[PDB]
Amino acid sequence: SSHHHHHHMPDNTIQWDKDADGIVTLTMDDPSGSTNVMNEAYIESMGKAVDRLVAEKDSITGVVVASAKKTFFAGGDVKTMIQARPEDAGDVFNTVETIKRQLRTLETLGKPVVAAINGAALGGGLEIALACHHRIAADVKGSQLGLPEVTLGLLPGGGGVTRTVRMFGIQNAFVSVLAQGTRFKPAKAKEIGLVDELVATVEELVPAAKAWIKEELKANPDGAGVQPWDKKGYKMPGGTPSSPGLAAILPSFPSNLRKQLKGAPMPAPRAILAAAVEGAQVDFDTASRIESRYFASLVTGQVAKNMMQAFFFDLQAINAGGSRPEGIGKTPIKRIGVLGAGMMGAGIAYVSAKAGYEVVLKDVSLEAAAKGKGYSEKLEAKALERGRTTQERSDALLARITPTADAADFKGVDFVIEAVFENQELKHKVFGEIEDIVEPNAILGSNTSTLPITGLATGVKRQEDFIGIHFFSPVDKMPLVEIIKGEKTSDEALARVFDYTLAIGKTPIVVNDSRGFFTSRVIGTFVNEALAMLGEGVEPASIEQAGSQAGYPAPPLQLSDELNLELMHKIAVATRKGVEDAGGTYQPHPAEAVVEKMIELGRSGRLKGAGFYEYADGKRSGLWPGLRETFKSGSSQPPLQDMIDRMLFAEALETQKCLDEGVLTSTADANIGSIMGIGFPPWTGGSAQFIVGYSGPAGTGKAAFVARARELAAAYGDRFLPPESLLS
Amino acid sequence: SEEAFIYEAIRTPRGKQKNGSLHEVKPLSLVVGLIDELRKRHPDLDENLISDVILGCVSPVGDQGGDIARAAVLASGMPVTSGGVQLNRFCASGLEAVNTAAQKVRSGWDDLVLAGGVESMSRVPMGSDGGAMGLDPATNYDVMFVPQSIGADLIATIEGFSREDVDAYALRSQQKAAEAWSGGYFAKSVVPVRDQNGLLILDHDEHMRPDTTKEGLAKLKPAGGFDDVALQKYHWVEKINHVHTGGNSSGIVDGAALVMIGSAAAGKLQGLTPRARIVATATSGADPVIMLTGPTPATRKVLDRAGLTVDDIDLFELNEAFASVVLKFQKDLNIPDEKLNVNGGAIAMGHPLGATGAMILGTMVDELERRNARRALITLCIGGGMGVATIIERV
Amino acid sequence: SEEAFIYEAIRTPRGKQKNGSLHEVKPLSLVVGLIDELRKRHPDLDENLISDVILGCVSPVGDQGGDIARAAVLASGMPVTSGGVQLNRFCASGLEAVNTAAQKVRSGWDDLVLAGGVESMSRVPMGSDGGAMGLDPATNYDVMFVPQSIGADLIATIEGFSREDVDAYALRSQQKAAEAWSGGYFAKSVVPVRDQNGLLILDHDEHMRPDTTKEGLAKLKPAGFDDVALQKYHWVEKINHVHTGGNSSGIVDGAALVMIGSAAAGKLQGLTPRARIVATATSGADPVIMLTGPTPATRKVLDRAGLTVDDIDLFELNEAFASVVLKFQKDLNIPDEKLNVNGGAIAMGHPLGATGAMILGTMVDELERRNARRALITLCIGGGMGVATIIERV
């Protein structure tokens, strides 16, 4: 029973100040970083401080928890959590038990404790504030509050699950706070109950906190320093699992969770719900201990290591300019010129104008360019009826989009983004009529998905400023930009497109010039595996189920109808000629006969009104009934796990080829690119992490991946054979 | 070694759920009333030779908690040596009580065992006892729990049973239940329930709608996240055709039933005449996500164990939890129509969970003697994907 | 008929009620943990030959409702044909499951049955299920229900057991239980409880107070039913309340499993029988005194097996109350050296639905350790019932 981790060294994190009134001000200020982090230094520092609060309890009337950083407290020690092996479960349990033993003492001190939240209070930081009896937040820009542990495959283990359930009940805490790790602005945090009151500036926080302590000691003398769940007669909102109202719908919560996850093997939300329900059946101390066991179960697991690797380390390395060329400085952007007002160009104009950039949206006719701006008006309309933006910021956003049909209106443009039809000589003509009108330092970007950038760059004279800027539909909701580097593309143009991508709120990856780039090439193998299985005679329902249960956002046949089978055949015609020049021609993927059989029948996709699904009034309505008779569905019934592994391994093995050929320069670009670009399941950590984190009957690791790949190769074809680089 | 015989099998009428006649009657009273009827039929029976009382009860809470079987022993003035044990195997709890009684008699360590079940669903609804699986989301997420209503619709989808097919069976069950009552089939087995003054409370199965037409069954409307969870396991199925309504599914009712089981020597000592013999029992199961396909392997097992086949069985009685469950059962084993649930079933008369197994058992005992037939096979689908089957032979 | 054999018998440690180690453990987990241990001890057993799983449970509500036996089958990944049924015969529920499993095997229509019981009294307390008798006052008035503690006090008054008499038995139960744990008797059968990470939760019966003294037991305080009990026992003037928390069974959490099968079922799986179920019996006595039911049940199971008291090497009676054991010892002249030789529920606890299987498995181990032949296991039951079982070491 100790507030320290070891019953048998790092720098102090917390400053101590007791005033004349006996109010102690614990100011967290980790001297080894810019943000207070729940590391070994904090645990020991709060251990010393909590010991002192008990030793000097006779001369202490209240406690204020403040911070000297720009943020309040955001993050755990991910460097340590990712190294926790299953044999370390004893240490992980003892650590979170010590953390919560400190917070439980601070919570039951017999005197009010106030959190002075001056900035971002995320994860462990909010868990600190949740241990206080009153939370005051400063309404500053950039401040967020929430428990994002689930987005890293973890759960709020410092009491977040136990306290949010005691505050809001099982259903409200899980849906609103715990299950998705939602981040709340200080205003919305007070509205739901995570924060109790607000102040305008950070300078008022500590005075307002000490003032609330003085008033609480005088107005509520017996309830001071006592949480609602520690008073006699506490009633959990929504009831306990034994309450008749909740016991009716409670056995249906795991089925709702399995529907939202679509059967994907993400274990973190399962554990959070389990810890929440099991905790509401017992006292607070026993509930907190149950939460520790589930936390240790996640941290020592593999999925948590995948998601920690991708959504913390890999994503930070990208945002820290990992793929950005060294030495190059910043260059502003004043006027963005978008060529083409399709669904792509319209979405590009929206995300650019939403960031404050002036956009000139051009098309072949003024009627067309205006309809592209209507895409932004309809998005601002839905955003206004839901109350997410003001009427003044919506009018200023649309005012930055200027539709036109004259090439002369591209005067003063220093950042060109072409989003026309996929065709080389068309892109050559479109760039030829505007390349001398834009500024001489203008970036010449091409939103092409397959055509090599070096070939498109010959149609301009300033080839050093020509570069591929590949977006994903819908642009207003897809977070990745694929930046393709042509042979003549300079490092300055690369960095300027990199900075543009961060400015619009997206994540960039740098890709060297090659057919299919990285996203189009890898997602093609995913679609090709599904179409192959359809030709092999597998039920179309089983194929779509395999896609969703693998963890993909959209099942493969549904996606094929959206990618257009006509365009899918053109990629087969294009890649045919490239390999014929080398030798041995190319082995036509079995999916190609399936694409042709669908085009011959006049079903090319959602665009043409009919594909693998029947489309009535735009909305998709059921699979094509003639699909089973066309491909003799049902004659092949492989295990569902084999359908899933065939789709995951094809993309993973294709990613490894891209890393070998030099298409990608880092596994961070591979993981975040596959996750944020084409929708690789987040529980894998990315199509490159999937190899080193594979888990199944063969075991776990790169060796088990090679074993399973060879098992697939014996059954379904040698395209699943692992490359030399994965062999050891 | 010893053979187990059925000496008597009685049941209460089944009162409906909404404004039911039995709603004011505690489930203990329903059991005690049947014990008193056995006393009126055979008053000179040495009750001390009754060595146990086994009752099935699916929701043993409230009025049905605290070992309702022992309560029936004390409240009815039975000897204190007569035991009393409650068991719960969901829907088959009534028949499981009969099977266990028969197996206890065969082992030679019990003489005369009273079995049956009781379920007052209007007073103790199903789910009232909670559930170790509903309160454990860590494992409920993995067993893929789906209400039996959807599993029935899934069976209709896979096997190709249309909405008109399940409604046609529901009409047949009403017609056969009405013909059985009017024909006097249930005259000696259904024991009317009375209050402490002798006044009548109920003497018929209230849940029956004998004026049912096929056009009215089509007007009915079929009964979050459950439909998508079921299709995750049965992935080759695109959509579930929802055909089951309140007109083609088992009714929620109150009732109780009793069966007296003992060895040949036990009956000879009390001047009792055996009515039927328990030939064999069997428990098996199938996939618990579809949850209602346990009857087929359990029936196949009880037939092999007794050395019999379908052609050797004269009457088939499967509980009518849902129409598709019975149609699936009839299709698998190729049951002739004229042998299956010949006196109607739970769609017409109701399904009082813990008591249904003993009710349909005693129903076949009577119909075998009425038809002068030889063998009958009784089976029930069970929650959790289980199955119980029993073969009786008339003596 | 076909003889029924015990092939394994294991149990969890018994965690105490107040601040207990097993309070954070669901009762379903206590059973699954024991199933997983059986797989560890015999990995090559064809689980498809397990035809039924029978679990005793007295308060089947909440975490213990919904046929917890079937839940254990599905949660532990056992074959879906393995059934699962819960039964309640009060305190004898654990032994009734074993007895029913044995009788199902003897009938021939079951091959290999998994029996046992579970009770988490710190999570689902006694009485949580309500009770058909306690909610019907019209007939609860004639049965004259009297709680178990007053019946035990009434036994001590009639038979003449002093306060020191029942506390002396409580002392030797704590002593013999401590000697059994120190001697290693329980090493094979008490399976420690661990969490989803393998961390230890409990590995010993934490209700034991091995430093119990005669003076300390004398300081405890004893616990309108007294008037009602004397209305039936009208020749008794005053009831001597002698039972405290130190000479009565303890409220604990626990679970136990007993694998039962025929001789053919064991030979087919390469298993070796540890003991044989010789006979079972069920009788009863007055429902106001309640706890005098084990005496006619033991006499009946002896008459049924063709044995006498002298043929039994070990007697195991559940220590619900000290006066119940002392009367059972006085009625049948049971020698002290053969009665609850490794302690009882006064020391280690009485987890209702699981106690019958725990004390049965205790005797399977002690017969092997002593190289003795026969043991008789019996429990007093609420409502005035009794259950007795005779096993013979093989």
Side-chain angles (χ1 to χ4, degrees), chain A residues 256 258 263 541-542 549 622-623, chain B residues 141 144 224 226 232 235-236 238:
Chain A
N256 279 285
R258 191 148 194 170
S542 287
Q549 296 190 32
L623 291 161
Chain B
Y141 186 89
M144 311 192 228
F226 289 121
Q232 285 179 11
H235 46 71
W236 59 94
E238 182 181 8

Side-chain angles (χ1 to χ4, degrees), chain A residues 21 357 371 674:
Chain A
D21 300 325
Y357 289 121
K371 292 177 182 176
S674 64

Side-chain angles (χ1 to χ4, degrees), chain A residues 169-352:
Chain A
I170 296 168
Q171 188 173 22
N172 279 346
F174 183 79
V175 174
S176 308
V177 173
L178 297 173
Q180 276 177 19
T182 307
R183 307 190 170 192
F184 304 92
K185 255 172 287 189
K188 296 131 55 188
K190 176 189 174 183
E191 186 171 335
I192 63 182
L194 281 177
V195 134
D196 301 334
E197 73 189 36
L198 303 168
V199 295
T201 55
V202 296
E203 290 79 4
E204 324 177 29
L205 275 170
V206 186
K210 296 187 178 180
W212 186 95
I213 293 178
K214 185 175 182 177
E215 174 66 17
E216 177 79 357
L217 289 178
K218 173 168 159 289
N220 184 20
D222 294 321
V226 176
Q227 301 276 45
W229 53 90
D230 287 328
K231 299 176 188 292
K232 291 177 179 178
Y234 159 77
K235 239 58 184 179
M236 171 179 296
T240 53
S242 53
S243 183
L246 185 63
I249 68 175
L250 201 73
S252 66
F253 285 168
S255 83
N256 279 285
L257 179 59
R258 191 148 194 170
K259 159 167 160 289
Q260 299 281 15
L261 302 184
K262 294 197 289 294
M266 243 194 313
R270 172 209 69 100
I272 297 176
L273 184 63
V277 172
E278 294 187 29
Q281 293 177 305
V282 295
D283 56 294
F284 190 90
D285 287 351
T286 297
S288 178
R289 185 163 63 260
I290 295 174
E291 168 194 290
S292 291
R293 307 192 179 278
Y294 277 103
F295 182 83
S297 181
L298 291 181
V299 177
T300 63
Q302 186 61 43
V303 170
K305 304 190 180 318
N306 297 344
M307 306 190 67
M308 278 185 282
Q309 184 61 55
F311 294 102
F312 185 84
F313 289 106
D314 289 358
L315 190 53
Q316 278 196 359
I318 292 178
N319 290 325
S323 299
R324 189 183 187 271
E326 296 284 352
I328 307 298
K330 308 291 273 291
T331 310
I333 302 176
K334 298 182 184 178
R335 192 98 53 78
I336 296 181
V338 178
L339 296 159
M343 188 182 298
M344 292 297 294
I348 298 174
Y350 175 78
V351 303
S352 300

